[PDB]
Amino acid sequence: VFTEEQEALVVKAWAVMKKNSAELGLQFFLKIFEIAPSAKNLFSYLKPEQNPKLKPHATTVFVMTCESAVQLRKAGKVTVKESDLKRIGAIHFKTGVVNEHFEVTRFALLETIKEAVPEMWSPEMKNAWGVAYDQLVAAIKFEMKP
Numbered sequence: 607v608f609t610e611e612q613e614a615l616v617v618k619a620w621a622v623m624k625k626n627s628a629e630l631g632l633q634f635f636l637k638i639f640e641i642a643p644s645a646k647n648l649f650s651y652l653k654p655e656q657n658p659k660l661k662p663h664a665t666t667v668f669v670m671t672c673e674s675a676v677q678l679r680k681a682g683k684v685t686v687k688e689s690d691l692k693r694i695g696a697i698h699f700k701t702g703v704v705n706e707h708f709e710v711t712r713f714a715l716l717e718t719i720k721e722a723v724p725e726m727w728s729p730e731m732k733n734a735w736g737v738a739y740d741q742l743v744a745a746i747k748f749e750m751k752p
């Protein structure tokens with residue numbers, strides 16, 4: 607169960623990091639592609655890793671993760687609109703985003719956060735971010751079908 611403490615951690619960390627989300631987004635994607643260069647292929651428009659569209663995807667991940675933390679504490683579930691979730695779910699399903707991609711991204715997300723606010727980093731900070739993300743992903747994965 608997602609706690610008020612974990613919510614506070616995600617909310618404040620994001621509050622801090624959000625001041626430099628430009629540097630943060632670039633770092634995040636550079637981490638994703640350092641680990642799995644071939645993940646590049648999934649973003650069909652990539653065929654510099656400088657691409658315009660990559661920066662908002664990065665921040666979406668951050669914002670929606672922080673939002674899930676809030677909703678999880680408030681209502682005990684991800685309460686993202688049923689329709690936003692179907693739409694996000696379908697695109698990921700159709701471009702071939704698989705578990706390993708979500709998983710590389712989780713790992714990249716945590717590293718990016720550890721590097722960005724090393725002064726707020728701790729295993730509870732890591733887990734709070736990790737769990738909000740996991741619940742967000744599971745809400746999306748339920749909508750990854752035909």
Ligand code: HEM
Nearest residue numbers: 645648649666667670693694697701703707708711742743
């Ligand atoms: C919490 C995790 C994630 C969230 C919240 C999220 C959210 C979103 C959103 C809101 C869009 C808008 C795209 C649209 O409606 O056309 C999108 C697109 C997309 N995402 Fe994600 N996403 C996540 C994970 C991932 C992962 C792990 C990958 C693969 C590395 C990925 C790759 C893509 C691709 C290829 C698109 C389509 C881009 C395009 O065709 O212009 N996403 N995502």
